[PDB]
Amino acid sequence: HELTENQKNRRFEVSSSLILRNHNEPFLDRIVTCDEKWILYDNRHPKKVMVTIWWSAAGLIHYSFLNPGETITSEKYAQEIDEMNQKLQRLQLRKGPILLHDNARPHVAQPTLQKLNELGYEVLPHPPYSPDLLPTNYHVFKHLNNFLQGKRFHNQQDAENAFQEFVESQSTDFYATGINQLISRWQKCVDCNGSYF
């Protein structure tokens, strides 16, 4: 993607504001974050399965694979947020969670917005065209790409089993790395006047 001037401005504005917010009142520890990815069956039309992973600095919260019958809708994403939140509630056994996710249509439509309001989630400002500011993408997915190269799955189950081994392979500090990098990435974005860095 070739950033326009308005897109760089939005990146710069959000970056600068988030760095100051965290300095004023640190909130990284309250972030829950996610993203969707298509996992190809052949990693050397083509079969693929979509995964959604949810996590915080404390660790893996929830992940799910899009199954036959299911549609990628705001209705589905709302049900996923409810399930994720139940798992977070078990795992956290005090300030409310803050969701960082991109502007994919289901993320920003009803009834996703109402679900977030009902469960007590703030949504973090996120600028368009910025996977370099989305930790699931710049951290988890980067390491997952490394892991999948260059495997071959036969079915959806083998693809799931490889994602599982990937997740279970990670050390306890792996997630914290991705989250904590946000400060440095916001700053690099400010340093480059809202461009990529």
Binding site: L60, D173, A176
Partner: peptide
């Protein structure tokens, strides 16, 4: 800390 991190998840149990």
């Amino acid at each position: 800390l991190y998840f149990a």
